[PDB]
Amino acid sequence: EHLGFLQKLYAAMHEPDGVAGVSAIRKAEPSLKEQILEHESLGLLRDATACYDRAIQLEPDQIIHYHGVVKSMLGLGQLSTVITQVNGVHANRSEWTDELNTYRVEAAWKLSQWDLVENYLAADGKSTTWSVRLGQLLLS
Amino acid sequence: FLPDHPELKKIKAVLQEYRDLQTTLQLSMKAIQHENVDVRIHALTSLKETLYKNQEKLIKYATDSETVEPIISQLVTVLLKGCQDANSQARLLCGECLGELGAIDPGRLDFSTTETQGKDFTFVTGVEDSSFAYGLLMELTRAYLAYADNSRAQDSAAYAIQELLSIYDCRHQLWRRFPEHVREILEPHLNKKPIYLSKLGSNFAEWSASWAGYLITKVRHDLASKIFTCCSIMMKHDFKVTIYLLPHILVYVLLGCNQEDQQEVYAEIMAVLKHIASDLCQLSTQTVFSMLDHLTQWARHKFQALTVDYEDYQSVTRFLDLIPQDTLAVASFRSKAYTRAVMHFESFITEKKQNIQEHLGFLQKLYAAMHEPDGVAGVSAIRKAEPSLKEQILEHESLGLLRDATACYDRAIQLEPDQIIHYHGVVKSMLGLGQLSTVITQVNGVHANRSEWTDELNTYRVEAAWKLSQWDLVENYLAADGKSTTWSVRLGQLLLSAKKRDITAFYDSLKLVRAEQIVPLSAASFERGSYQRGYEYIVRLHMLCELEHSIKPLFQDSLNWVARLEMTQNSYRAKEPILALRRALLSLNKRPDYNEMVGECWLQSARVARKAGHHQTAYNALLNAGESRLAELYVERAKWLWSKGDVHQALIVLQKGVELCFPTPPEGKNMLIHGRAMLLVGRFMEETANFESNAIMKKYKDVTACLPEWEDGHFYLAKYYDKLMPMVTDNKMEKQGDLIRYIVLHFGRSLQYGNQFIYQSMPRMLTLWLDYGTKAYEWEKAGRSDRVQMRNDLGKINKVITEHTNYLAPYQFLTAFSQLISRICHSHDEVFVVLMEIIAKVFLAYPQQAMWMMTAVSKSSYPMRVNRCKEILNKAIHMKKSLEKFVGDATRLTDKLLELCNKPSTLSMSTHFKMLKKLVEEATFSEILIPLQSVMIPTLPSILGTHANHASHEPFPGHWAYIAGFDDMVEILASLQKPKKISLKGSDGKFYIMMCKPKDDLRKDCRLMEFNSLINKCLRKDAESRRRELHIRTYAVIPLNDECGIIEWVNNTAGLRPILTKLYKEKGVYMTGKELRQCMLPKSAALSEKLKVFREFLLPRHPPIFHEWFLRTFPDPTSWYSSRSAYCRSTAVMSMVGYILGLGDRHGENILFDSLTGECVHVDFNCLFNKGETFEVPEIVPFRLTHNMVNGMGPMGTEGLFRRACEVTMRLMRDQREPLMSVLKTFLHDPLVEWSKHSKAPLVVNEKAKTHVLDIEQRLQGVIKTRNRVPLSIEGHVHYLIQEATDENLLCQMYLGWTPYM
Amino acid sequence: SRLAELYVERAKWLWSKGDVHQALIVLQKGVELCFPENETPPEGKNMLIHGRAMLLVGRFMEETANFESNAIMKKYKDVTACLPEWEDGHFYLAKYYDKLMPMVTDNKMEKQGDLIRYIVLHFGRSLQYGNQFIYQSMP
């Protein structure tokens, strides 16, 4: 009963150490999204990629769930892979194409290609975009 | 004549004139061989039915012993004679039967007995030969005969037959040699050049015809001209006939040609090398290679030789000079020559010293073609030049490491995209660990680009859809469906068929899948050892066979997938796919129960993963499944993670899992799993100070309590107690046995259940029992403490022997029966003598084995022992009246053998031993099956059968040869103190000579042979060892005389020094014996001074002949490549195991090479722990490394990837460290072996030898020990050994000994 | 960069991997990467890497069973030789000397002394060159 509040509490803390203690504390191992929250505390990309894949296998109703896999692609930091993830994401997100495009734009900053920059520039997002919006200023 | 009969009575009538399931199988094996191919197809259908009829029972025949079933071996022969049919349908039916059989582990398969690829060489000089003329007659036969059916071809064919008649009379020794028959019916009637390939040459033959007109002018031989004129008309009649004629014609062309014309012909050959009609040009290049093979035959004629014969050799050399080996290699890549191409590449490397990097570029392409297990990496290590990063990515692909650098292949794509194929490799990376989501992302990316590959990726996606087991995914697959199909893609099409419910229409598609398998079968025909090489392709076929059984249920033999898996070989490369195919079958099933059924298969895959590492993949596998939670299953996943690391973290997780599993109740598997978790906890307890050993023992005791039935829990506990026991004295000694007896009793009960690790553990338990018996006697001599307290221990020991007797088995005896010889030599007496009686009971179980041990015992005076052995014989005589009579006949035969062995160019046993020859002829001595070294080794019980498998199993099971005696006149070996070997004719008729040499401690060596073929069996067990296929030869030793043991010698065995001598003779280089005498070495020679003189003398003495030796060793280029694999097997890990033993110091003469398969041989390694090496000169080198032996080893690269692999084998070899230690304990234990050099002491131990045993343990540690300070890496230990081999400093230190210029 | 540079660092990544034998292959590879038989480099930045690589090779050698104490000392002497000025070269050398010193005493304090003085002298020179290993050196 404490744990459901605790999982929310760990997120508010945004502290890995608090999350790790909660995982040890829980009687039942976290699974699916609960497992995914554990993965973020774990900090291991390969485990996260597997967790994202397992979550997708159970269901793929979340753009954010796709985004976490994209974050794993960012951990991989391979430009060809990031583009491959982006192309798959654009078709998959018919409802929200380019939601991870800003993540792709950061990848474009990694790409350091003006033409790659142009595709992101062509994309328009109503988001701060974090560093990537700064990258758009960098793009010209 | 015998055939299956629709009506039983007709079959019965045939059967009575001719004169249970296994016998039927034996008839079936005869049936599998077919006089008529059409007859064979009916037999194949019957055979598939027979396997189905066998059903679960066929699986039972398959599994009974860890050693592969002999009946399976007949079945294995059936596989060799199975799906290899020129008719596609005939091969397919045989393949379907193999699928019902399923796939045996290649390591599991024991059929190395068949001659297989090895055969007497086909090549003959030809044309002069009557048989070569017969081959020309064969050319007239068959396709020329088909031409004869055509009228225009027939008139020319009849003229050709007349020309053959002109060469030899149709009538008559040649006629008697001739087959005649259908040929005999033919015989009575008989009584400027851009042209080649292009333009006029057309499909090879037309080009050949223009060449033939040039050829007749080139060769002036009168016989050659007459044959040529006849040949041209025949060549027009058949292109294939022309090609057969052309190799002989080419040989004539080489013998005679215009010097300018020959240069033009060489230029034409280069032009083809530089360059159905296109296939014909490739075939023509092959024909040119065939001409080169003919040139090799001419070279063989030159070899028989030793002006024109020398001049012809010079002309052949010129023809070789016109040829460029590098050009041949460029042609070879077009050729897809592969191993044949490699042999040409090696020759080019040998011909000219080359920079490795210039060598490396050809090599990297060659490795890619090779698909060598070392592949690119061995070349990369060899290269002194850093690889191109794209080349390195290709090398990573060659490694197929997967995991890390999968991204790196993607990263090269990220830096730039130049290859769609490179992208396709990236897509395989995109598949990664079977991730469906990655595939879903990949499909959209594939969609954005337009490529043929993207559809192929979609096929990969379809396989992902198969993992998905989703009908909608199948619907996505259907749009993808309809494309050229990869074998996996075709499997995806089959998955589409499963959605299809095609049934028989699907079955025809399955037949199409079978045709792809048939292409694998075409690959399968090949040189011996091909079947293990083709096993992985066969496994894909085996998966198809499993699919067909699944399909029949869908359309509507237990065939357990798990039952099949234990028989099936497990491959890091292929086992995961085999598990994946089983997972695909589970996905295919729509059964309701199966909602929880599918995961265990992933978990078993996870167990495979623990062996294969890929731990992240293994975690992925848990993600791949999940649900249907089993506390043990989670615990097992934790255990694999624990093996990777974080054992304490895993142990805490396991403790949580145990609480989750139960609020002990066996609960079927889970309580056993809980005990297993406890065993992991006990290992953790050894790991953790916080864990308490006394608490663990109670926990271990609790685990024993949880299941009385499981031997494995008891065995683990017994091992734990032994660790509790090893320091239980903590050097206290004194009282120890009462606790030890409880452990021994537990060991016996675990043995009674039986264990996978039980045979090694039992050997240890027997050794411990022997140790206790020695210890009690030692206490008894002192009179220290209480004689009664020791007596109570002796009674407990007696109780353990009785417990064994209640549970005692001949199978249970196994190694101990061999050990008993040390047991026989015991001061104690009393109960130990009573234990000996149990050993006598084991002797009763098998007479021949008992006799072999007894014969050694008789030769030692053993006067107290000789009486004790006689008493054991007397007890056996009391036990069986028949047994006593058999023993008496056996003793006389052994005595007769001993007299022959003393033997007080061709020595004839009848001529000097007239009585001995007469006795062999006489049947009056009771008939004795001939001793077999393979027979001596114990048979191994199957892991699968828990109870009575050993009782069913022969203690050693094999067909048994019975000695037929030896020929009255035989060749006798001549050597100083030469052993003389005569091999008795087999009851089957195979005969092996055995040679015995006096004053040799063969029995200590025989244990060393026993210390072998157990590790070799372990290599068969190792998946990696099977992939190496590094089979280890086992010497056969029968030293019944303590002084002399007679050993069969393999045909073609060569002393390494003698083989080297043969190479020196081939060079014709001579080093004066006086000149070697003229060289002088001070015993205290300066190391530098000795090395400089030695190197200079050696280089003149031994320019390497290794390249020459390989070419001489196999005429076939393919044979040479197989030989190269054989060379890699030679020495290598087998040499490493001896170095690991530290006992050997084998002479170079002691090392031997066998011509037929090339085998390194180690014999008479009397030294143990290098006692001989310590004497006189000492060499620390792990193996003798003559540079020419190294030069054969160096190959394309002097450093050996195979040598590194052998080191990998050695690291695998130190997996059963305890088992190795037990073997070491046995070597120390035997009386006949002396740690420090019979009747006088019928019933040698070195403290230094015990230290040496510690050194062997240190070798398992891999600690240098010698090095100051310093911490051991197994890969490093191999590298250090490699460094030691590289150094010539040890060779300079050595005096005489290997003494090798090379 | 033609010099192993980051690739020499990659051998350090191999050290993060922790396989010494792979590192040993890397140690052979690094000497080749600066030159087939590269000397500590004439360029000062290259030289610092070349000495550091020798130091990495020496640490690897100390790990290696197949190492010669005299050979390790020669490499350390070379490391001091490539830069008298660099604190780091002495500090690896100073550490090397201490490991050598415990073995050198061979259980006798009296035999130890002249070797100890040379090591102390290197330590003092290193302390002047830099204080980064100096606190460890000071104890």
Ligand SMILES: Nc1ncnc2c1ncn2[C@@H]1O[C@H](COP(=O)(O)OP(=O)(O)OP(O)(O)=S)[C@@H](O)[C@H]1O
């Ligand atoms: N077929 C074989 N090929 C090669 N070596 C063999 C073969 N059979 C036995 N040997 C070994 O080589 C020896 C052949 O005798 P020689 O070497 O000429 O002289 P020897 O003194 O009788 O034997 P040693 O002990 O080997 S020098 C045998 O004694 C075996 O040790």
